Symmetry: D2
Subunit: 427 residues, 4 copies
């Protein structure tokens, strides 16, 4: 007997849908009653998911554009926010390669356990929460919002609409702000820039986008839903059942029973228009960093959905200087923003920053031992004027915060950490 | 009914102890019969734990000295090996800060779930095996041994001798090559360079080393056992029961009941000698990077144990250029090796390399967007002449390997990944 | 920039502590300001933990007494509730034996990973939530509250005050209603009815209780804190520092440095009184089910703290019929309730029901194959008149629920589960 | 530089395939060189997987038949072996319902994380290893082989051939003896006795079986591979690309693009013959327990493959007494064995034993408190004459085993468990 967590009435839900500007362009093919019927008698409050999704939605409208870097560890996200970024991108590619629950290194093909990204989302939020806590006790107002919104990779759902539903639900439980879903066959999922991609029917992805929204509704949070299409390079599709896809079907079939389909921007535009009512943002994977191709896509889509916001993947899978000059590179994101691409991210930033920095250090260490490390430590000290604080690793990880907890429990405790530490007397 | 995994006889074990040089200076207060009684009727083979211990032991004798860098992710270890390092250091500090099973960020005080380091060991080995697999299909002989031995942090055991036993056993099952254990009170465990450290009786740590050895023997592998003392800065000890510790006891007690003790190199020397018979390597934590203090410790210990190998923590908790000139820094590790310090490691190398590189990239990204990232990419392309291979992230993470698996299952498969990928056409 | 999760002011918190009857007899040695200082700028809502603690507190006052059985799996808790129980006990013993994150079977000695119980708490709540969801779609009002409050085993905290804090915080995040803590040395933690137990100083356990409370306050939920003392059988204590323990210290020391101490009800009474101000419930481990011993403890404690509610462990570690007659056995709990024992539980109920039920079936199966199983099924069908529902396992595990989700996403889905199932046409 | 784990040469592998009777009827569409190319330079030994597979294979030939019950917890498997069973069945249904890594309760539709079953296989082997260890120190020869082979559910692979490969590998790493794979679309996977099942092309499942074999070969263990067909009830198939399936295709298509197909024993027989060369055992799901249908299937298959062994699911999804009489029920398994069904199992034995047993105890407990539990304890005492040993829960879970470890580390330890325990003085 308790009123804690009591579900909202179908009427209240309906009202929010009809009045909140958040749902201005959102179409739901199910009823408010349907949502309530799935909430049981208790609805858990998902604080981080709600706040994150609200902050993300706001930033997408108030800022020229929202950009982010892929993070595969908690500390990565902390450094990103400490450096001034206002969003965190959680790459599935990076999770596959260096942060998934199987413990194995995998290429980007939906090989890892379906709850891996959810765990990293939870992990990133914990890391940001610790930074937040530490900033409070240090009186550090350097960062206005440590709990930056997280946009996580839902890939192809790892199966059908039910798998999609459970993933969205888990991402929310972990505190995610937004999630993206691609129109690829889950069992043959390929990285956006790897070959051998197989698309699924247009309607099937709409079911995916619908299931993703339903989980969010049942969890009572305004999670930002992003639809991604891989039709730009995919030359295969699982079925010709959907009339909207038929125009592109060549008729040829593979041993596996797939159908050949004409790839390119035309299919992406069609699918994007079909997903628009079910997506807060739309993303088109491309084979190169091309502002003109992006313009073409944006204009064609906005021609039918003026307010449709877009997302763009500034992929490390591109050999940037091989395609663009420094001038264009420097204005790349600003131009995309000018064309409606409000969420931009470098998917594999973390994988590259982590692998390079360690290769570089290890190499130098192999040749000059301590000298190579001291150079890094000195760069860290030097970056302190830019706001860097990890040089003092103890406090950076909460040594001061836990000392506070220790002294709160027992002020006369003789086992506190920072007092007498080398960090206190050498940094 | 099978002979697979049939345990060795006590006699066979005894002969190994009596005739294998590996055990030349190893004291065991239990018997071969005791080991057998604990093995049940089936003994699991631990391939990576055996190979790693064998390789590690060998390198400790054939090389001028073995150095390593702390790694907290699989890719980290891969880069370390790719760069030439022949050993991997698994820091418990880094695990607490950014890689433990609780999902939280913690200061180095044994706050995380006890099976966290074992998981990282398993993860590191998996990552190294993938690199190994990839190198084989790429005909890459750049690296002689991808499976570098892993030396992991056992901290203070997370409890009693039984907790120690389970941790060692879990580390072995994951493929660890060596593990270190410190003489601190588990419940008040502190980072070597944090204050408020509490020592446990000398005999208690001997029970710990004995327990670590027993686990290794029952798992039938020659795991390298490292003994660590924190008596250099620790001014508290749990009890005065051990006569060997009494000389340092002042008589004063804290409100918790701890005994004040006189810290310094003197207590470290006494404990080191007491641990020697139960340690393959001995490590003394220090408050500064001082070669003279190190000599003092080494000469004192070797005076009674000439063949006793030592390990040294070239800790990032030291402000290096504040204590030494570049000349000393440059020869630091070489000088230590000349004094018997055969295993040297930079504990928090991973934390700092990861935190700094992401802050650097994120900061520049916040100001110039793409230009900041392109700079990293170009440094990566340039680093290839040094042997760096992660620029091509797809193959680096196994895309080529799984393609091989796919074409092995079905050579006519129309869903391979690398063929038609941007990496193939742009790198 | 969001108001979601904004922390309460120190004033608001202080007011709650001064006016809410919940805190009537609760002593807090820290201030509201200390709590606020640890909450960062965002406080996550813990719906289940809040509701659960409120319900548990109310039940302890409205019911003659609250009883429960140990549950180690989700389905177990579901059946317990389905059967009419209004509380779930989560035994640490059972987790060690058949449900901890190391995957190993362990005796009750704090050998498993410290986040094991929290994970089981989360699991039990998920199971109850599924049942709640199913009941709602089946219009089943059989159970008033599927979300029964969970009382979990915190054992000895797995270390110091900080480990205690993290465990309580984790239990709360998983949705626990109450948690218990014992005054034993974590590193030598023993099951209540095993020998070799080592107590810690009275004041140290008060620190544990204080830390457990602090964690709940920072988490902003009225978690029920339970204090357990093992002084009935323990003959050892870590230190003689505390003046409240000295009367029982005999002066003798063991080789490990522990002090011999006189066990019995007298030390338990002394400790219970000392813990009273920091415990919503006090529990004393006993070596036999004795109503007179229980009365002795209850009256002595209530003499100074009239409103102090107690908890009692009706342990399977007792050979019940060897100590009591059926008449006493039948009135046992009712009697304890009359004496202030408002929370009673059979710790190892799950372990025994599971191990016995499977041995019995397996044994019979090995002799009469299918006949043995048919007997079980028939007993299940029979149990349906009593309220049993697992006979139809498909709906019991949510098949009907996910069909609802499936049809909400796509009404014309041709892949629903129950339609055309053998359960639908054979049950 | 070590020879430990050195891979076998292709020649050695080829010889085994040509000479070992284990591979007598095994068709491999890839070469020995292909296997070697994927093993890198180190092959980990999988003791439990090898021993288990070997034992299982042997028992499948030397016994009239091998039967098992579904196990979802370690203790469950232990009691099954204690009772005399010589194999353990690991149901995916039970894992989804009460033992998967998501912590949620799910119907049987491949909703849980892909590495869930592997974790349970590891858990089950750990539990059995403890029982083996305990038995050794107790001088208990009651059980000849505690390490009974485990047959695990690989379901539909959780994706494509690569997902299948990873699952098999993980199962093998965990120590599985055999694994089964079904010809259902993973993204729509349904319990064998639930409706809405979609089959995949015949050739596709052959790729699955081939991938499962390849994974075992690379892992260098003779894993028993089981092929399962769901064509008996499935009225849908993803594609009509395979000519072996077209005879059953009706021509109609669903909105999702699925093809209607004619279900029955006929499609099962055809698929079984096609899988034969790639399966050590073949299993067809049935809607009812029918000995004649089983004969029909068995004879038709053995007509072309005389040595092809079969597996049968004595499913709890059948209302046994509603279909058969006690006479048939009693001979059922013996009959099936007489027809080539060498591996028989009751899939949901653990779910029902666990759910019923707890409901029964909880119900009585809710009514008569302690009286209800004493009844169970008394039954447990009585069962001791049949071999039951869990009554003494302390030793059952290894308290005596760890006491052995403790006294081995320190024979003078004053903190042993069994001495002074109530189990010792009351049982
Ligand atoms: Mg991705
Ligand atoms: Mg450490
Ligand atoms: Mg307990
Ligand atoms: Mg199954």
């Amino acid at each position: 007997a308790s009123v804690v967590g009591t579900p909202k009435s179908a009427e209240q839900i309906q009202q929010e849908w009809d009045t909140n500007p958040r749902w201005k362009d959102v179409t739901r093919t199910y009823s408010a009653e349907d949502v309530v019927a799935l909430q049981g008698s208790v609805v858990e409050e998902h604080t981080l998911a709600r706040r994150g999704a609200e902050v993300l939605w706001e930033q997408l409208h108030d800022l020229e554009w929202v950009n982010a870097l892929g993070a595969l560890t908690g500390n990565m996200a902390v450094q990103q926010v400490r450096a001034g970024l206002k969003a965190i991108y959680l790459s599935g590619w990076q999770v596959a390669g260096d942060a998934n629950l199987s413990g194995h290194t995998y290429p980007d093909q939906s090989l890892y356990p379906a709850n891996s990204v959810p765990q990293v989302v939870r992990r990133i939020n914990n890391a940001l929460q610790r930074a937040d806590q530490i900033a409070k006790i240090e009186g550090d107002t350097s960062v206005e919002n440590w709990l930056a919104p997280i946009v996580a990779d839902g890939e192809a759902g790892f199966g059908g609409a039910l798998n999609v539903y459970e993933l969205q639900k888990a991402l929310i439980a972990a505190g995610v702000a937004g999630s993206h879903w691609e129109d690829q066959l889950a069992s043959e999922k390929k990285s956006g820039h790897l070959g051998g991609k197989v698309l699924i029917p247009t309607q099937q992805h709409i079911r995916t986008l619908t299931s993703a929204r339903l989980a969010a509704d049942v969890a009572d949070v305004p999670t930002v839903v992003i639809a991604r299409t891989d039709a730009e390079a995919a030359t295969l599709i699982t079925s010709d059942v959907d009339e909207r896809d038929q125009p592109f079907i060549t008729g040829e079939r593979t041993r596996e029973g797939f159908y050949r389909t004409k790839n390119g921007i035309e299919p992406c535009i069609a699918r994007a228009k079909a997903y628009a009512p079910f997506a807060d943002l739309i993303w088109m994977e491309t084979g190169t960093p091309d502002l003109e191709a992006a313009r073409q896509f944006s204009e064609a889509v906005k021609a039918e959905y003026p307010d449709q916001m877009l997302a763009y993947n500034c992929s490390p899978s591109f050999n940037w200087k091989k395609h663009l000059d420094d001038a264009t590179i420097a204005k790349f994101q600003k131009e995309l923003a000018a064309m409606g691409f409000k969420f931009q991210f470098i998917t594999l930033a973390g994988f590259h920053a982590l692998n390079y920095s360690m290769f570089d250090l290890a190499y130098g260490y192999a040749q000059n031992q301590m000298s190579a490390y001291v150079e890094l430590q000195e760069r860290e000290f030097a970056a302190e004027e830019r706001g860097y604080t990890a040089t003092k690793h103890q406090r950076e990880v909460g040594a001061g915060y836990f000392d506070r907890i220790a002294t709160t429990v027992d002020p006369n405790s003789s086992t506190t950490a920072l007092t007498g530490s080398t960090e206190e007397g050498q940094f």
